[PDB]
Amino acid sequence: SHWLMKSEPESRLEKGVDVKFSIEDLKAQPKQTTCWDGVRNYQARNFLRAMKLGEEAFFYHSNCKEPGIAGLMKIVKEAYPDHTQFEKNNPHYDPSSKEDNPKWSMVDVQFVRMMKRFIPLAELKSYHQAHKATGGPLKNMVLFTRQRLSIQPLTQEEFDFVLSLEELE
Numbered sequence: 001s002h003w004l005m006k007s008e009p010e011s012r013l014e015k016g017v018d019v020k021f022s023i024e025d026l027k028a029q030p031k032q033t034t035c036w037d038g039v040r041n042y043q044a045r046n047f048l049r050a051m052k053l054g055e056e057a058f059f060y061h062s063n064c065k066e067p068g069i070a071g072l073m074k075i076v077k078e079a080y081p082d083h084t085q086f087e088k089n090n091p092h093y094d095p096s097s098k099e100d101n102p103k104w105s106m107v108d109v110q111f112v113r114m115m116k117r118f119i120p121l122a123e124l125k126s127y128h129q130a131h132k133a134t135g136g137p138l139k140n141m142v143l144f145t146r147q148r149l150s151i152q153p154l155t156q157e158e159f160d161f162v163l164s165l166e167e168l169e
Contacts (some may be wrong), residue, residue, distance in 0.1 A: 002159040003047070003057035004037060004143060004152040005109070010063055013044030015091035023059045023070040023114065032111030033076060037045075037084045038092050039137045040104060044151040047108050049079045058162065059108060060143075062150075067121035069162065070114060123165065137161040 009022035009124035019038070026034055039045055053058075053076060058069045083091040085097045085104040099104045121143075128138040138144075138161055154162075 001050070001055045002053065002154040002156065003051065003055065003075075004060050004069075005057050005073075005085055006060040006062040006150045007036075008063075009061035010065075017091045019091070022061060023073075023111075023150075026073065026109070033107050033108055035083075035108055037082050037106050039082070039106065039150060040085075040092060040094070041148075041169055043146075044117050044149055045103075045105055047151040047153060048105050051075050051078065053078055056112070059109075060156075067117040068124070072112045073109040074112050075107055076110045079105040079107050082088040094118065099138065115117060117169070121163065121167055124162075127165070129160070 007021050008019045011018055011020040013019075021034075026032055036048070039048060056072060056074050059071045059073050061067060061071050061075060074140065075122050081102040082092070082104040083106075085102060085119050087093055092104075094104060099151045124138070124141075124143060127136070127143055128144050131137060131139045137155075137157040142149060142154065146152065
């Protein structure tokens with residue numbers, strides 16, 4: 001399995017709290033690792049639960065001015081409870097979640113490297129749209145299939161094409 005994980009590159013307040021966290025903030029983490037908290041989308045959650053140690057995931061910046069894939073990271077820790085679903089403080093708090101059996105989960109990713117060059121959502125859309133008429137590996141990419149999924153699986157095909165655009169100028 002291969003994945004795509006979205007996060008806020010530039011600052012933005014939610015329920016009063018800032019959810020900012022780009023690829024650089026991950027690199028700036030001890031051992032360049034962090035807990036990918038926040039996810040409250042059932043379909044997104046069930047993917048987090050299905051991730052295996054070692055599998056890789058593109059770090060996607062969900063920005064307005066410059067959305068795209070800036071780098072790569074890996075899963076070093078399998079799903080477990082998201083501590084913030086309970087902290088009444090956090091904007092992702094959930095009253096319906098029992099500590100006895102949490103509804104929300106998270107995983108731990110470690111930084112690996114950056115793309116040999118940034119990949120704009122614009123670049124991804126054109127090829128995607130292109131393949132969507134000629135027949136290509138990005139014909140059914142989730143990034144364009146699910147406009148609102150923060151955690152997404154990618155077939156080796158799509159993954160191989162994203163990496164190939166990395167070796168182009």
